[PDB]
Amino acid sequence: INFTNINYYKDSYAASASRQDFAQDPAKFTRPVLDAIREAAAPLQ
Amino acid sequence: INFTNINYYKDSYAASASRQDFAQDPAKFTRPVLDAIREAAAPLQ
Amino acid sequence: PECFTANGADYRGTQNWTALQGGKPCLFWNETFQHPYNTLKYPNGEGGLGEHNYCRNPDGDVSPWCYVAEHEDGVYWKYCEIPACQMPGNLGCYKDHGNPPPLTGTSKTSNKLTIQTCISFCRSQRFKFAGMESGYACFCGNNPDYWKYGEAASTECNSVCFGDHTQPCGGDGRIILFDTLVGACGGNYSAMSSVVYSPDFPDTYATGRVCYWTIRVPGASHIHFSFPLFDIRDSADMVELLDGYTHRVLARFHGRSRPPLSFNVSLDFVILYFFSDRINQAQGFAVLYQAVK
Amino acid sequence: GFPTELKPGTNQFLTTDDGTSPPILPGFEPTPLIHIPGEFTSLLDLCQVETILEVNNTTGTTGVSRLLIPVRAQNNVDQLCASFQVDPGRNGPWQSTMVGQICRYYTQWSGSLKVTFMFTGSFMATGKMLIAYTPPGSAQPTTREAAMLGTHIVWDFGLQSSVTLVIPWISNTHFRAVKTGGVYDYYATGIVTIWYQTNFVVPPDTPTEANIIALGAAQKNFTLKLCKDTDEIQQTAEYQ
Amino acid sequence: GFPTELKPGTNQFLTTDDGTSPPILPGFEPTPLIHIPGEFTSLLDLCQVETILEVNNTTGTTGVSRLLIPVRAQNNVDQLCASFQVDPGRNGPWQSTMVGQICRYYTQWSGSLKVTFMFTGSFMATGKMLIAYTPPGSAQPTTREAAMLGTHIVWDFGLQSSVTLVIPWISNTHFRAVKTGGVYDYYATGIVTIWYQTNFVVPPDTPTEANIIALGAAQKNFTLKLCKDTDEIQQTAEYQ
Amino acid sequence: GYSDRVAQLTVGNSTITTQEAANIVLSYGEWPEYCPSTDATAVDKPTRPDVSVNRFYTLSTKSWKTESTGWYWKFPDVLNDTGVFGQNAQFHYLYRSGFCMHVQCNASKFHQGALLVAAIPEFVIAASSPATKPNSQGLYPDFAHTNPGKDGQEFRDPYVLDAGIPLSQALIFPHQWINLRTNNCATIIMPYINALPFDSALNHSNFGLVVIPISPLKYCNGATTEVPITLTIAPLNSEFSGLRQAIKQ
Amino acid sequence: GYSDRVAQLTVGNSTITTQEAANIVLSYGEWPEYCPSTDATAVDKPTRPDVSVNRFYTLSTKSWKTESTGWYWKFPDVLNDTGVFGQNAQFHYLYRSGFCMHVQCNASKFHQGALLVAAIPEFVIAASSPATKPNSQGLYPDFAHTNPGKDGQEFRDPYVLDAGIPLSQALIFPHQWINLRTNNCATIIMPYINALPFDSALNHSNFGLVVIPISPLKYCNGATTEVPITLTIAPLNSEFSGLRQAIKQ
Amino acid sequence: SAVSALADTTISRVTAANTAASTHSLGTGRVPALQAAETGASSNSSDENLIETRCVMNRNGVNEASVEHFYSRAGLVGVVEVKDSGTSLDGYTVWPIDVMGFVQQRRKLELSTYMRFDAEFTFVSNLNNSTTPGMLLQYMYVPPGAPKPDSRKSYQWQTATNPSVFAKLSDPPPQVSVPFMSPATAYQWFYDGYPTFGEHKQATNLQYGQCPNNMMGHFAIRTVSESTTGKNIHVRVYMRIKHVRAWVPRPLRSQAYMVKNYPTYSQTITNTATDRASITTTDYEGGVPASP
Amino acid sequence: SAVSALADTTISRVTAANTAASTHSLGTGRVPALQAAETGASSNSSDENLIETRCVMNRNGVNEASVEHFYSRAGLVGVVEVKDSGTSLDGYTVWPIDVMGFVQQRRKLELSTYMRFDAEFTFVSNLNNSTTPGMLLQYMYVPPGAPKPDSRKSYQWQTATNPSVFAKLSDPPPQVSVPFMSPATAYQWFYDGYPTFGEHKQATNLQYGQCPNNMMGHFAIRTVSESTTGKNIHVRVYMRIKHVRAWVPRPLRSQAYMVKNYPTYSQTITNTATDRASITTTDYEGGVPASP
Numbered sequence A, B: 001i002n003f004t005n006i007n008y009y010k011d012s013y014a015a016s017a018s019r020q021d022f023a024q025d026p027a028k029f030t031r032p033v034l035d036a037i038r039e040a041a042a043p044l045q
Numbered sequence C: 001p002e003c004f005t006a007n008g009a010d011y012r013g014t015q016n017w018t019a020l021q022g023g024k025p026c027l028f029w030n031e032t033f034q035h036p037y038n039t040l041k042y043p044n045g046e047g048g049l050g051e052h053n054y055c056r057n058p059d060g061d062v063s064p065w066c067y068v069a070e071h072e073d074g075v076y077w078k079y080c081e082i083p084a085c086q087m088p089g090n091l092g093c094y095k096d097h098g099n100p101p102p103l104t105g106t107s108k109t110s111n112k113l114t115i116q117t118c119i120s121f122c123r124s125q126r127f128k129f130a131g132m133e134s135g136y137a138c139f140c141g142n143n144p145d146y147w148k149y150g151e152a153a154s155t156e157c158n159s160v161c162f163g164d165h166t167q168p169c170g171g172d173g174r175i176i177l178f179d180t181l182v183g184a185c186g187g188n189y190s191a192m193s194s195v196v197y198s199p200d201f202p203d204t205y206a207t208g209r210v211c212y213w214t215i216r217v218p219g220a221s222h223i224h225f226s227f228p229l230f231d232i233r234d235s236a237d238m239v240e241l242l243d244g245y246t247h248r249v250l251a252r253f254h255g256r257s258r259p260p261l262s263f264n265v266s267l268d269f270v271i272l273y274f275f276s277d278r279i280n281q282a283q284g285f286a287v288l289y290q291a292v293k
Numbered sequence D, E: 001g002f003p004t005e006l007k008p009g010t011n012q013f014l015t016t017d018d019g020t021s022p023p024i025l026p027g028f029e030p031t032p033l034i035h036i037p038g039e040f041t042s043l044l045d046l047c048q049v050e051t052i053l054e055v056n057n058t059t060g061t062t063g064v065s066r067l068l069i070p071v072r073a074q075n076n077v078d079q080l081c082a083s084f085q086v087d088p089g090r091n092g093p094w095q096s097t098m099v100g101q102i103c104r105y106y107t108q109w110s111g112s113l114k115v116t117f118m119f120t121g122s123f124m125a126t127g128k129m130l131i132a133y134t135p136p137g138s139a140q141p142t143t144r145e146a147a148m149l150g151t152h153i154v155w156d157f158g159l160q161s162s163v164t165l166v167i168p169w170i171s172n173t174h175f176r177a178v179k180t181g182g183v184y185d186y187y188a189t190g191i192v193t194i195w196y197q198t199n200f201v202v203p204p205d206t207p208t209e210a211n212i213i214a215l216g217a218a219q220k221n222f223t224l225k226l227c228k229d230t231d232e233i234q235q236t237a238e239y240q
Numbered sequence F, G: 001g002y003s004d005r006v007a008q009l010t011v012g013n014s015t016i017t018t019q020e021a022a023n024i025v026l027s028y029g030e031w032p033e034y035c036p037s038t039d040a041t042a043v044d045k046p047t048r049p050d051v052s053v054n055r056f057y058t059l060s061t062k063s064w065k066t067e068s069t070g071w072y073w074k075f076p077d078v079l080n081d082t083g084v085f086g087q088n089a090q091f092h093y094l095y096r097s098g099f100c101m102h103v104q105c106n107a108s109k110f111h112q113g114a115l116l117v118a119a120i121p122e123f124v125i126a127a128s129s130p131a132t133k134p135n136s137q138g139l140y141p142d143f144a145h146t147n148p149g150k151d152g153q154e155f156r157d158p159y160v161l162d163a164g165i166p167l168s169q170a171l172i173f174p175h176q177w178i179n180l181r182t183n184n185c186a187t188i189i190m191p192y193i194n195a196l197p198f199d200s201a202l203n204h205s206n207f208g209l210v211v212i213p214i215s216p217l218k219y220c221n222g223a224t225t226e227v228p229i230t231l232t233i234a235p236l237n238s239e240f241s242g243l244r245q246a247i248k249q
Numbered sequence H, I: 001s002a003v004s005a006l007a008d009t010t011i012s013r014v015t016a017a018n019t020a021a022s023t024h025s026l027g028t029g030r031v032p033a034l035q036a037a038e039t040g041a042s043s044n045s046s047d048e049n050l051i052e053t054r055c056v057m058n059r060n061g062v063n064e065a066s067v068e069h070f071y072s073r074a075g076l077v078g079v080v081e082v083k084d085s086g087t088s089l090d091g092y093t094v095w096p097i098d099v100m101g102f103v104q105q106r107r108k109l110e111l112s113t114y115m116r117f118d119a120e121f122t123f124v125s126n127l128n129n130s131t132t133p134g135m136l137l138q139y140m141y142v143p144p145g146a147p148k149p150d151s152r153k154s155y156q157w158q159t160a161t162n163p164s165v166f167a168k169l170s171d172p173p174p175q176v177s178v179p180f181m182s183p184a185t186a187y188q189w190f191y192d193g194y195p196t197f198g199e200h201k202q203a204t205n206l207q208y209g210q211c212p213n214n215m216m217g218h219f220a221i222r223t224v225s226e227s228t229t230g231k232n233i234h235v236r237v238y239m240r241i242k243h244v245r246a247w248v249p250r251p252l253r254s255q256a257y258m259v260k261n262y263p264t265y266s267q268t269i270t271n272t273a274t275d276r277a278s279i280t281t282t283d284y285e286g287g288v289p290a291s292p
């Protein structure tokens, strides 16, 4: 029985940390290329 | 989950500030005239 | 008067203390090798540095400083509150508390503000006093009561001017006030002793200044002309002490004509002349006359 | 006893804490609320009311004369009548405005401004003025040719005696800090310069110098943020 | 008064306590959130970006030269080009990597690593390298015959200039402590040695010494645990 | 979608004609109304002498000069000794009423100048004094300045409205300009504003009526020097309760 | 499922042909876009001079030597005095634009070396100074190093990017290598990145454009010594608001 | 149930006016720029009708400029010294309740003519050295007419009907909710009148502007002591105005106040705007022009 | 009702990537090992395609590496000494709010270029001897433009609009929630530009990198006192960054910082990696080989 993530103030920024939206999108840093290269393929053919 | 705006006392004036009724009616100060003047119109015609 | 420059980069005045009362001692320059400024990196003079703990300004900071023993939280230097290092035209550092301002008059915020750009702004409006504040604010006024909020330590006005980071331009709530005669392109001087400066003195004198200062003490016998500062290193730019009634040259000073310690004149009416070429502008001069009745 | 744990912020008195407190008067019913005309519920409604800009804030000018922009018959063409910065919270002409004083109770402002210029010359006085708003980055335009490159209105004097120059919200940031000067010239709003588009022409036996009254206000998209304490009146002792 | 009992931990300030606190600004609406490119929501996404391993962290080697693995034509066969430990948080070549610096903000790491070697010689320079990962328990292999008993890749230089050697997650524990040395060599990851499978063969009038650039990163199964404070920059006085 | 320059204001037996009118300011968008049963507190039946008191009273004519500072009136005080309104204001303890203030200043098309006609609720008049003890007389305005009567009072410091508030922000109040090139009259219809449903017409002045020259009256030699400013006001929805002996002040 | 080595980049009247290309880095997977209505704050209608400003400007050619440290440009500053882009950047207070940075360095199959072409958002240039007072000039970079213009600036300490950050982690930024055995060009398409929808093209430089030799240029006697590095950049989706007098700096 | 009410308790964002896209207008009869300020009305000219605007879906929150948010902030309304040392061995002080003694609260209130509000009064009491030793204080509200205490032992402190707060200095600041206490519908920061009938011909004329509808009694504070404590206690009273209803906005005060209950400015009138050199001089340097 | 929301409030475990079982591959054209690092893309090679892997149903939690968990930790952002003894009898201190004065918080923030966040500021104040006597302090937030106090008695402490916290040293650390206060969409730890137009030809060039969008005013702290207390109070400010939005990740700082608002490293550049004897020397002894 969990009783947390409760805001006691009318201002939304007084709430606790937003710790329920873990999203991992590494492609914008790891594969930031136009031509999607398959793993099994030689990249520069 | 918000838990606020709660009065703990039988007197209604012990409640918190009334911060949920933002109303903006500037016409009583900006256009306090009898003849409503259109924007596109020359006022004194 | 020991300092005749805005930043104190003329002080050789034997003060080995951050403040005359309630301060810290200064570390010797021949012993501060842990730091950039010492006698090893500056062998021969080079900023009044030597074998002494005296406050100096070798780096062109806003005020004479000195290395202190690094103990508190890494503070290894402190500005020196030298009360005799006030520029002869510097009226002091005063507090600015609110809307009745120290100098009631005109204001100007300039991201290029210097001490002279503020004085020149106030002098162009016939204001006696020019007050720099926060490094960018310039205030003018004829108020004889610019001290209405009390004086302040000279170190409290050590914010760099936004146009010249070697000059002090006040601070948060602190205003540094100058007499707008400083750096004027001439003027009448009828007084016993006054330190007449080069045109636009805290800055470098402009190219093309032909200025005439009238120094007539009505009743004096001899005028003791001394030059505590003559950074006039050039050829065409010359400082002449023209006579009065006769308007005849009495002493001409330029680069290779540096003036004696006292070029006294027997005339009670002298005309300090200044010339400036179209190039090679220097820091200027700061003459000091003393009338002997 | 219900188990509780006191957290930081316990026992503190935050002056901006909208919380409950015990009522000193049990069962107190106040005097009934009758209708009073002129209720304002938003300070932005007050900022949209046009108030006189003190454009003639010059040395020597005293009293109501500080509220007048002098306009006279010019001997030369393309001359400058008046200029003023449009930073609402800056020490200057906008201090005399309701928008410029309510701005000072806030740290950041946003939205278009509005200066309505009213010509108070004779009916026989004719003239055209170029009122230009110069967006940031430029100093006050030195010529009318340089000022007409910005947001401007060519005002023709006539039966309608007033012109409105909207200072559009041309800013890089969504809000501008009310504080100006120093590095806060990053939030400079610009400069409004009034130029003689044509001359100020009058017939004989007519006054040759008139006045323009500037009326600054805020547009409908005006917004304030981060309520602070103004720096307009200072106090050294409790008023007794 | 509702009965409550204060428990231990009352009045304490835990620096990692996700709790509420009163807002200083009632009714504050911040500047709108516009889209900014390049938002990262996970530090593991940063650890998967390949960054240059400082494999030439040797005395005398200065600057960008510390990022190059020198490869030259060998007079003998089966020689060692370079070696480095694959402990991400150990003082060594992995310090220069984003994974090796984000690892130091955590106590325990897990998952496969990845070193992409890029050959930066002439197009005419050909060669085959044996890049071997030696799992823990063994020192650096003294011969290529001993290194080829571990996880290795025979890299052939060619049109594709880069090879990837995955350091597989070969561990007894689910996590390895980022701290190394002493009894914490229990969490040793292993040693990666680069051997000359064949020689570095070049035609005449061609440079005989080239460089391999190692690019270390983390695989998709990489995971960090127990956020701590890194030991990379020290401070003796508040930055003024 | 425009304001007609001609206007006729007929209240009681009084009628005001203007041919150069800007508009009619309805103060705060609220017409004068009689006190509702919900807002009333006094139990006596009020007297509503409709046409005998609700009518235009031309009260004062002030000569606008080049160096004139301005004038202010206090609305109940300016009518407390005039007509049947004054009698009801003296015989009755309680009073409430709106008004239709009509300021008139006509000048030739060769004159120039601009008046600021504003109706200031609760126009507390300030005194301009040096730093003095609270015993000092100069710290507080005399009764001639607080209640100027029908003659009005010449502003001492119109820049601060003789109230410490900047004149430039007096436009927050129901106002109208008399710009001599544009209009010769300013009409302001003000409803009864008070924290009380009724109040004493003698003690309390609900509104101030300021007429301040912002742009000074300038003209050339040969133009008519005397340029008057006339204040015609008309009570609207005047009620009076609490009948007793007539009290002057 | 591979990247073709041939590529043609046609923007405006400019076209760039490459026959040895690795790929095209789309910075953070986001193409340059015009400012949406939701993210905009300035009310003036922006100018979008599509083909006159969005085009490839070949700006600088730097001779790669064996001991070369590298070069960096600041994207708005490098185009602020060039073409119709520069004019719009000077006449308008506000500006936003992506770019298509194309670095070109071709060498024979007997040359070797590797450049790191990275586009660094908010590339604040550091100064390398001894321990000195905040008064010291060496603590802060001069304007020639912060805004190098179109000529760029030779790196002083490419190992720390002249920013105190390790060059080895500069690959966290949108980057591409010019490995002379593999490719002769590096293309980076960078969208407008800023905490603001628009910003001054003169004051603020949104991105740094670093070209650092990681593997030094080595060749044998007889090979062409002069191996140039050319920077061709193209604005993409350039908007300009706040028209005024043209401001240089 | 009523869980729907607790859900809609956070402040919702009301945004500013959006700007519509506008094009060029070349014609006659349509003059949105020409106004008539004589009409007393502010200009209805919009940005779209004076320049070519874009579509700006404005998301700036206007909610903070409300009268509630502008006023619901605890400011200093009173400093009451409970002198119990030296020549003043009283141990008690009866303080006239007035919120116009300090400039910051006074200037905000005088923005409006009438204000009807409840208040949250907070008492931040301490010694001269800022220390708060456990010392029992009694803050008794003495409404108009209730007998004021004349000593620290007098019978009025029995507070059988008067509201009273007992709190040590060591306790967190005592905080109470005060209702709208006034015979009028609203408080009146400006009362153009006199409280009593008469001639008002005094040389001082102290009664002008004094509305007893605002005079809400006294705050009697004492140390709950049997003799002199030798310590002076400084009670700082902070009023947070809640449930605000403001009427008739006024110009914000420009002259420095001189007294508490009277508008009274110096003969040296301070200009609302600071002086500059000329009407054509602005101190904004901008950048270097491309071609002067 | 909303009891479903309170049920799903505990942090759910997001696991790492599972490893699939892989077999041997003997063929042509399939080269998952060969990459092209020139393309600027990290290698897409998986462990399954380079070695024979097993099926590992990975249950390692990746949830702690989030930007929220990495940043939502109160670190020291400011040490403010309220000097009231010796030569500095001020009793107050106005502290420029800057979070870049201490290395641990600064290096974590500079991982990102832009950060938009709310903060939980905590004030841990005490004397030099670590003791916390009951001493009333006032922590007033002075936003940019609000008048800064010039004494312990000045009018600015009336805090009619400024946020202010009154708390004794004996109280638990004052803790408040600060919103995202910035004219920009996000804070900017790196601003490649100048705040003002101009020539920027000064010998010092102090304005490079100084974005006023980050300058969020001052924290004015005073002892609520009438004279000197003779005691210096050390206020340590701890910022917990919550509701974090980070953009444009950057290399973590490798050189030691020298100043607060400028990237400035020594001429003695420290290598990111520690030096070893040779490129072929690793200091891992391992075990005794079976047959050397």
Ligand SMILES: CCCCCCCCCCCCCCCCCC(=O)O
Binding pocket: D024, H097, H098, H099, H100, H119, H121, H139, H140, H141, H163, H164, H165, H176, H178, H181, H187, H188, H189, H214, H215, H216, H219, H261
């Ligand atoms: C137990 C202690 C309780 C405190 C009681 C406080 C009562 C305060 C009265 C309400 C304040 C607002 C009205 C002030 C009006 C006076 C100003 C004036 O017109 O001079």
Ligand SMILES: CCCCCCCCCCCCCCCCCC(=O)O
Binding pocket: E024, I097, I098, I099, I100, I119, I121, I139, I140, I141, I163, I164, I165, I176, I178, I181, I187, I188, I189, I214, I215, I216, I219, I261
């Ligand atoms: C009552 C006391 C309240 C405390 C108010 C604290 C306000 C803090 C501001 C938010 C901190 C983040 C922004 C810091 C950015 C400055 C760093 C820099 O760029 O130099």
Ligand SMILES: CCCCCCCCCCCCCC(=O)O
Binding pocket: A001, A002, A003, I003, I004, I006, I007, I008
């Ligand atoms: C005060 C009562 C609060 C009730 C909050 C909801 C808790 C639900 C209990 C089940 C916990 C959720 C996970 C699960 O389904 O096992």
Ligand SMILES: CCCCCCCCCCCCCC(=O)O
Binding pocket: B001, B002, B003, H003, H004, H006, H007, H008, I002, I005
């Ligand atoms: C103790 C339980 C109190 C529950 C209060 C109601 C909260 C409802 C949760 C949803 C928040 C409202 C805004 C929304 O619909 O997203």
Ligand SMILES: *[C@@H]1O[C@H](CO)[C@@H](O)[C@H](O)[C@H]1NC(C)=O
Binding pocket: C016, C025, C026, C053
């Ligand atoms: C300062 O120098 C003088 C030189 O005579 C010496 O007597 C004095 O002791 C010095 N003081 C300090 C603090 O070094």
Ligand SMILES: *[C@@H]1O[C@H](CO)[C@@H](O)[C@H](O)[C@H]1NC(C)=O
Binding pocket: C028, C030, C031, C051, C052
């Ligand atoms: C520095 O000079 C002073 C004065 O002669 C001398 O007393 C002192 O010993 C010197 N110190 C060093 C380190 O040379």
